[PDB]
Every structure is written in C-alpha cells, then in structure tokens.
Symmetry: C2
Subunit: 87 residues, 2 copies
Amino acid sequence: NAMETPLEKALTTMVTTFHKYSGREGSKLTLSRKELKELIKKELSLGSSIDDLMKSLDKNSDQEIDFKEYSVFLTMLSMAYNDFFLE
Amino acid sequence: ETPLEKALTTMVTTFHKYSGREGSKLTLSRKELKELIKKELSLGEMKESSIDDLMKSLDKNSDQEIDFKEYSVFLTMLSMAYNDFFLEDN
Ligand SMILES: [Ca+2]
Ligand SMILES: [Ca+2]
Ligand SMILES: [Ca+2]
Ligand SMILES: [Ca+2]
Ligand SMILES: [Ca+2]
Ligand SMILES: [Ca+2]
Ligand SMILES: [Ca+2]
C-alpha cells in the first residue's frame, strides 16, 4: 500500500519481520531462541549474550518471545540510536 | 540497511522531526504530538478531547512533554493494532 506514511510502513515492517521468523518452528506466534537469533543474524547488525537477551525479554518465563516481548526488544534498539541522535 | 533497520531509524527521526520545533528539542509538546499524529498517520483526525486524553496517558511524569520513552508506548499501541490486523489477515 503505497499510500501508507513512512511511519506506517515502518511499523508494518516491524510486525511482518516478527512473523517471518516466528513461524519456522514451534508456535508461529512466538520466537524460540533459535528463531530470535536468526532474525537478529539476518535483519540486524549485531555481529552467551543472546541467552541473556533472551531472558530479559521473556517476562512470562515461557521460553518463547511473543509479539509484546519482541516490541520491547525493538524499543531497546531504537533507544540506543535515540540516545545519541545527532541532527 | 535492512528494512527492519530502516524502520527503527524511522521511529527515531520521525520523533525528532517534531520534537525539535519548540521547547526542549528532545520532547514533544502537546502541539508537537498533535502535529506528528496529523501528518505522519493516515486520516482519523484526532479531536482536542482525544489529544488531551492521550497526552495525559503518555505523560507519566506530568511535565506536559512526551519524551522518547513515553512516545514509545504510543508506537507500541500502533504496532499492537497492526499486529492484530495481520493476525486476522493471516
Ligand atoms: Ca516459532
Ligand atoms: Ca515469553
Ligand atoms: Ca520483553
Ligand atoms: Ca519540543
Ligand atoms: Ca509518517
Ligand atoms: Ca513527560
Ligand atoms: Ca512511559
């Protein structure tokens, strides 16, 4: 939909990126650690601290990252750039 | 460079496009929040009553400014809304 604003397209990409990787194993509604790392490896530039990331994110302790837990991860990455924003 | 990386960059630069217009360059006034919503989201014009309520819900420290952390709660409302749409659609 070309008529979506730049922000709308961004938010859409955040949502589709989750579901692109959550449907590889297990529930398609959640990311396993394997699935998380594969989104991290392929979609981000972050190349034992995953499993620590995994734990910080898994607020319900169910071993899986759902959409609300992934949104917190995205905000972490956003804030890291916002902290040092130079106009 | 990835779509997801450009998306997160957009979250930041959009905030700053409007937060730097007046007052603190790092926070959105009520004016700046209303202008962000008007321009950067499609249709659905927000009434003054609606801006008030969203302002008061986001402004957890009552300084009448929306900082990036408070603004991140709004982005999540929008993501969550589209997630529900994507789930139904798929
Ligand atoms: Ca899965
Ligand atoms: Ca979980
Ligand atoms: Ca979380
Ligand atoms: Ca401002
Ligand atoms: Ca926009
Ligand atoms: Ca505030
Ligand atoms: Ca907050």
